Design a protein around this ligand. Structure first.
Ligand SMILES: COc1ccccc1-c1nnc(N)o1
Ligand SMILES: [Zn+2]
Ligand SMILES: [Zn+2]
Ligand SMILES: [Zn+2]
Ligand SMILES: [Zn+2]
Lengths: 73, 69
C-alpha cells in the first residue's frame, strides 16, 4: 500500500542517519573528543584534524560500541 | 499489507535499540570511557563505577551527539 512506501522511507532515513557523514558508506562508530560529535566511521575520523560539525580541534577519537551496529555476520 | 507489518517491526526494533539499557525510557547519549560502550542515557551513566556490558572500570563518561538525536 502507500503506507508500505511511507514506512520504507522512514526506515531508509533512519539507516542513512547511521552512516558516516563524510563517506556515506560505512557505519558511524567514532566520537570526536572532546566536542562529542559522533558522525564518522573510523577511517574518516582518523583523517580529520577538526570536527566536521562544529570545527572544534579533535584532541583524540573514541571508538563507540553502539547497540544498533550491524555487520556481514 | 503483511509487508507493512514487517517494516513496522524493523522500525520498532531499531528504535528500541536506541534507548538506554538501564531505564529503557531515555535515548542513549553517553559513552563509558575508555571501553567505549555507548548504551546509557546521561542520568543512568552518571552513577555507574564499571561498564554494565564489559565490567571495565569507567574513568569518565563522554556525552555524545548522534545524528538521530
Ligand atoms: C539515539 O541514537 C542512537 C542510540 C543508540 C545507538 C545508535 C544511535 C544512533 N543515532 N545515529 C547513529 N549513527 O546511531
Ligand atoms: Zn567514513
Ligand atoms: Zn564537534
Ligand atoms: Zn537511562
Ligand atoms: Zn564496556
Amino acid at each position: 500500500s502507500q503506507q508500505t512506501r511511507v514506512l520504507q522511507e522512514k526506515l531508509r532515513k533512519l539507516k542513512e542517519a547511521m552512516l558516516c557523514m563524510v563517506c556515506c558508506e560505512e557505519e558511524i562508530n567514532s566520537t570526536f573528543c572532546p566536542c562529542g560529535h559522533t558522525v564518522c566511521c573510523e577511517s574518516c575520523a582518523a583523517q580529520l584534524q577538526s570536527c566536521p560539525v562544529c570545527r572544534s580541534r579533535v584532541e583524540h577519537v573514541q571508538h563507540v560500541y553502539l547497540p544498533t551496529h550491524t555487520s556481514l555476520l
